[PDB]
Amino acid sequence: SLADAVAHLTPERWEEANRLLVRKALAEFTHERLLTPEREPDDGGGQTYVVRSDDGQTAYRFTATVRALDHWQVDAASVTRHRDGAELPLAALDFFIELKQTLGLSDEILPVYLEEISSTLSGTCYKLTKPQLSSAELARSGDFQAVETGMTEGHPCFVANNGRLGFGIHEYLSYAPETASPVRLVWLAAHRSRAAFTAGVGIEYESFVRDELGAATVDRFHGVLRGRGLDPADYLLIPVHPWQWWNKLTVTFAAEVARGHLVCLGEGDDEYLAQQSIRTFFNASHPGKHYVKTALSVLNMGFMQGLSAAYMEATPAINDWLARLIEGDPVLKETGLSIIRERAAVGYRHLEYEQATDRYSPYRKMLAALWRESPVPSIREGETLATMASLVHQDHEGASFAGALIERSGLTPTEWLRHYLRAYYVPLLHSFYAYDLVYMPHGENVILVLADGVVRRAVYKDIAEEIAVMDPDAVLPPEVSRIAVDVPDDKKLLSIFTDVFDCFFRFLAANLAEEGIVTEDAFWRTVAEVTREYQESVPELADKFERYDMFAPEFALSCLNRLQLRDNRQMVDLADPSGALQLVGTLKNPLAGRL
């Protein structure tokens, strides 16, 4: 109705959303040491802190509990703001304008950054309008996509995390995952002179699209091409995000459309759900068919969600080499690890934009797609699926979704932890130590298999784009050897300490202690024991276990927000070794002393 598109934008909901983001900015900027909150002694008997603006006129006061890994658990309800003796409302845009110098926001970035904050607050507002499911309801539900679309936090480190800049509000309401709006994919026929299909082992092109689309939808598509005088044999099918088609391909790639390099074939019939990754689609009409990952030229969390055409050629081969490696490794067999492969990929090489740009240009990232197998067919009765991100979910009441899997399970907290850590964490140690293999194993990149509230096994996704072998001489099959990187010995283990300890377990341990379920002490003792249990079981690697010490007293603080604030479009650039990293002192390893 026009008014309906903005109904979620009200003073009360805006207000809650601003208290929520300022709470997280005080928390996470303090963690990253942009803010050093000073204590005031009286009220909470050691619990009240102030942070001042660049000019020192405006003060932010809060109650916080400081947990392992220099984690500030800032109380939302406690946040207040003062200038020259009086109180002001909590306003995120103002907070950023007031601590511009202090956070190293440049004149250049600050405005776009405020636009990403607005958009993050807009989403918070939309989600505060959805039925407010407790973590109990959501865990009891056992609906994979009720959990996928129920998540509210997004990336727990990045403050400006849920931006989706590029979507008008109409497009936010149609495309953001938290809406759970069905999407039909748009299907193009891409001429073989500029498009290329890559198949994983056991994939054949004709049967693959037959399986995905149905014989009848393939023939109809072959009929659009014949009616236009074109030979179906000269084209490959490429599905696209409807936003990419209507806003980019019809304008940016108009030449391709006009010349018949791209023919529009229409919507496919199946209904998709955008996942936490906004450009990845799960097939709601047929949960067993492939996810489709699409090119989407929006700004989110320091990157265009474009998809590289050039990465596609090697992508199924990387997945096949990894699946085979997991199959053949006793330790990985025993954790129950599995991936959902990227089975198939199609790239489109825009020849002219290629002649006009470098290999790093988002103008070469505007038309690819890949298919990735669904985890649904692999589950048995009593099993349900949930993104690992669910484990750091709190509901509207502060109630941990992990806490609710624990209550549902009947296990002690720590028994429950040991099943999860054996399934998710031990594969990561083994992969590091046995093969120098690291993934990007954050909430979004792992799916848990649950049975009566217990983590039975973990499924890694996002394989070709994310995995590395940290050894430049790694002998690999020619097709997968791009994964071989050069990372200095003193940084290798950060793959575990940063991406698991500091960017995930910090939140999990905090949530469980805050809600009174189990001490950080017990939490970290459990991680320690699983670590020792794994190491004891592979004595062949003892020299490497000492070289890369999981029980080192400290490790480097790697600041995630600092990357985004120095560059709101290219967070990490063409550093093909690494070292766009912002390392600022060290944290105390909660494992220090438990070897």
Residues found near its own copies in the complex (CB under 8 A)? 1-3, 5-6, 9-11, 13-14, 91, 93-94, 96-97, 100, 107, 110-111, 114-115, 118-119, 121-122, 125, 165, 167-170, 172, 186, 224, 245-247, 250-255, 257-260, 264, 266-267, 352-353, 355-358, 361, 363
Q: Is there binding between residue 445 and Mg ion (CB under 5 A)?
A: yes
Question: x/- contact string, 272-291, with Mg ion (CB under 5 A)?
Answer: -----x--------------
How many helices and strands in the chain, by DSSP H and E?
Answer: 24, 26
Nearest CA to 277 among 489, 402, 442, 488? 442
Runs of H (alpha helix) within 156-202: 169-175
The partner residues of 38 in beta bridges, in order of sequence, read 50
Contacted entry of Mg ion, its own copies, ligand ATP, none for residue 276, CB cut-off 5 to 8 Å set by kind? ligand ATP
Residue 591 to residue 595: CA distance in whole angstroms: 8
Q: Is there binding between residue 171 and Mg ion (CB under 5 A)?
A: no
Comparison of 168 and 585: residue with beta carbon closer to its own copies: 168
Q: Is there binding between residue 149 and ligand ATP (CB under 6 A)?
A: no
| Planar angle of CA 244, 250, 251, nearest 5 degrees | 100
Comparison of 26 and 176: residue with beta carbon closer to ligand ATP: 176
Question: x/- contact string, 454-493, with ligand ATP (CB under 6 A)?
Answer: -------xx--x----------------------------
Residue 236 to residue 314: CA distance in whole angstroms: 18
In the complex, the smallest distance separating the C-beta of residue 388 from its own copies, rounded to whole angstroms, is 30
Nearest CA to 561 among 551, 548, 571, 547? 571
Comparison of 365 and 461: residue with beta carbon closer to ligand ATP: 461
Q: Is there binding between residue 178 and Mg ion (CB under 5 A)?
A: no
Contact (Cβ atoms closer than 8 angstroms) between residue 31 and residue 72: yes
Residue 186 to residue 268: CA distance in whole angstroms: 6
DSSP 131: -
End-to-end Cα spacing for the chain: 63
Q: Which tokens belong to 480? A: 């997968």
Q: Is there binding between residue 419 and ligand ATP (CB under 6 A)?
A: no
CB nearest Mg ion: which residue? Answer: 444
| Planar angle of CA 279, 280, 282, nearest 5 degrees | 140
SS3 label, residue 388: helix
Nearest CA to 299 among 279, 282, 281, 315? 279
Residue 148 to residue 303: CA distance in whole angstroms: 22
CB nearest ligand ATP: which residue? Answer: 277
Question: x/- contact string, 376-395, with ligand ATP (CB under 6 A)?
Answer: -------------x------
In the complex, the smallest distance separating the C-beta of residue 579 from its own copies, rounded to whole angstroms, is 23
Q: Is there binding between residue 155 and ligand ATP (CB under 6 A)?
A: yes
Contacted entry of Mg ion, its own copies, ligand ATP, none for residue 305, CB cut-off 5 to 8 Å set by kind? ligand ATP
Comparison of 119 and 161: residue with beta carbon closer to ligand ATP: 161
Residue 523 to residue 459: CA distance in whole angstroms: 23
In the complex, the smallest distance separating the C-beta of residue 160 from its own copies, rounded to whole angstroms, is 14
The interface with ligand ATP within residues 299-328 (CB under 6 A) comprises 300-301, 305
Give the one residue of 123, 154, 306, 316 binding ligand ATP; rule: CB under 6 A: 154
